[PDB]
Design a protein around this nucleic acid. Structure first.
Ligand code: K
Ligand code: MG
Ligand code: MG
Ligand code: MG
Length: 222
RNA sequence: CAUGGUUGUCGUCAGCUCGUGUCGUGAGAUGUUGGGUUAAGUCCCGCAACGAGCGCAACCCUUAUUGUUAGUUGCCAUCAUU
């Protein structure tokens, strides 16, 4: 990646000055118009390190989970994670998704079962009311657990967009000792993420750019 | 005021709970809360909760129309007689 790519993506922008985090001054270059400016030089070095770390993790054969519910991030993380073949959560992270992984598997099994009924032909013979209700249920299960529907085990790495937004996701990660590679913003906390990627979380283009670098890293590892 | 069984009661009110997870040092909490909505914890949405069970609802009986099968002990429109 190039610092110019970042600048076009608008990565350098941060949040309002008052809404920053003092711990983020280690990666803040200067403040403009009441807003902070990330240090894109540290950004370039750190994104390189994250690409390297993601490549190493993929080479280990572990499983990667890309998390983002931010409107700027949901579609981007979905596409990039699907492109990498690794699993994603885009709409809403369910409490206990990983800590209660066992229970969530029951819902995933339900989702697979409802699909089998459709393929089997039960849906055709099901009464109008029954089939309609199952479509609604199936839709919700796909809506929530769809992006990880076929995950075999607990992920060995979690990529995150705006951990401050995905507070619960970071908490589950820490509980399970899952290393986190995160898009940390000027208002976010760096101490909670192993591999920090100082970047604007509120730019669609920037989220796509960073997620694309990471998806490329994992694909290259595989 | 040793009990089984049976029964009254709130009340046919929509409540009562558990599994896993999570929070709290702990008793506990969460879900069951909230915006809607319903007769309903009925249901949608959101939510560190995800599910599940007893409930609720439906399955049951009866009444309101009617198709067909049956047509005597029942019915009499078409018919003729009492
Ligand atoms: K519990
Ligand atoms: Mg209650
Ligand atoms: Mg209910
Ligand atoms: Mg809720």
């Amino acid at each position: 990646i190039s610092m110019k790519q970042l600048l076009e993506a608008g990565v350098h922008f941060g949040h309002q000055t008052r809404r920053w985090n003092p711990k983020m001054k280690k990666y803040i270059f200067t403040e403009r118009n009441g807003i902070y400016i990330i240090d894109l030089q540290k950004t370039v070095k750190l994104v390189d390190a994250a690409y390297d770390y993601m490549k190493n993790v993929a080479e280990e054969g572990g499983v990667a989970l890309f998390v983002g519910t931010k409107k700027q991030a949901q579609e981007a993380i979905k596409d990039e994670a699907i492109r990498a073949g690794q699993y994603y959560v885009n709409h809403r992270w369910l409490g206990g998704t990983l800590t209660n992984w066992d229970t969530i598997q029951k819902r995933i099994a339900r989702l697979k079962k409802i699909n089998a009924m459709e393929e089997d032909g039960t849906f055709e013979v099901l009464p109008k009311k029954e089939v309609a209700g199952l479509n609604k249920e199936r839709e919700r299960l796909e809506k929530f657990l769809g992006g990880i529907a076929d995950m075999p085990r607990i992920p060995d790495v979690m990529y995150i967009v705006d951990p401050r937004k995905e507070r619960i996701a970071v908490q589950e990660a820490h509980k399970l000792n899952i290393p986190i590679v995160a898009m940390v913003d000027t208002n976010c906390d760096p101490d909670e993420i192993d591999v920090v990627i100082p970047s604007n979380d509120d730019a669609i283009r920037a989220v796509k750019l960073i997620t694309a670098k990471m998806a490329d890293a994992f694909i290259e590892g595989n």
